[PDB]
Amino acid sequence: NPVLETIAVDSTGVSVAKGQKATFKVTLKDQYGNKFTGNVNVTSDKTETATVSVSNSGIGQSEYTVTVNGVAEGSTTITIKSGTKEVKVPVNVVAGGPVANYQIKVLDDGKIDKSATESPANNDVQLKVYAVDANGNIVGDITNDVTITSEATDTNGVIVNASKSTANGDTVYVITDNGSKKVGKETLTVKLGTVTLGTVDVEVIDTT
């Protein structure tokens, strides 16, 4: 019978400037490598350095997003625990250097399900764009500063809307279906004014 075996994580360590936040994903797995539903606790072992929170208040799922807030320069660890299992994830909070490059981050699964009845509902993609210094530290969230667009004229039957959603000083770019007739990839272009920063492909699926 399946038991929790691994608290899988998509980060080997968080690197963030003071005053910035960064995210990573947890996936609970059984001994066979399949998803396992269980609850999780997240704790910072030095809250004066960094604080931490977890999506869905850490209940009822096999996948969670952990958010780390850089409070003051220093190093610490995030401990993620479920039952007898734990993972300690390194955290480094730095002053932060000048911007070296950008990361286009997909917060969800990167998919929009144009089915009328999927459960759980899966009707968007959520994007952030980060500024990153030469050492790989997140030094800014520039999601509000960028413009994200798809092709002006549809050429593949996949049609999406992209809209900035801003509250309490935090911006997410939210992608939704806009009358897609087909499934497939749609290329989004990310620009800072007239400068192209990169592209990201979102996917429309249909699980009906």
141 binds Ca ion (CB under 5 A): no
**What is the rounded CA–CA span in Å between residue 74 and residue 48?**
9
Q: Which residues sit opposite 105 in a β-bridge?
A: 128
The SS3 of residue 57 is: helix
Indicate the residue among 63 and 108 with the shorter CB distance to Ca ion. 108
Residue 177: which of 119, 106, 125, 102 has the closest Cα?
125
Please identify which residue in 5, 30, 63, 108 interacts with Ca ion, judged by CB under 5 A. Answer: 108
Provide the 8-state DSSP code for 38: B
The region of 74-82, 134-142, 148-156, 187-195 touching Ca ion under the rule CB under 5 A is 148-156
According to DSSP, the residues that pair with 204 across neighbouring strands are: 112, 184
154 is in an annotated binding site: yes
Q: How far is the CB of 152 from Ca ion (least distance, A)?
A: 10
Closest to Ca ion by CB, 82 or 156: 156
11 binds Ca ion (CB under 5 A): no
Q: Is 156 annotated as a binding residue?
A: yes
Rule CB under 5 A: say whether 65 interacts with Ca ion.
no
Could you say whether residue 158 binds Ca ion (CB under 5 A)?
A: yes
Question: How many CB atoms lie under 10 A from the CB of residue 67?
Answer: 15
Identify which of 172, 165, 169 has the alpha carbon closest to the alpha carbon of residue 130: 172
Site for Ca ion in 161-190 (CB under 5 A): none
| Interacting residue with Ca ion among 30, 63, 145, 154 (CB under 5 A) | 154
181 carries a ligand binding annotation: no
- Check: CB of residue 25 under 8 Å from CB of residue 64: yes
Q: How many helices (H) and strands (E) does the chain have?
A: 0, 17
Which residues here bind Ca ion, judged by CB under 5 A? 108-109, 111, 113, 115, 118, 122-123, 154, 156, 158
Known binding-site positions for Ca(2+): 108-109, 111, 113, 115, 118, 122-124, 151, 154, 156, 158, 186
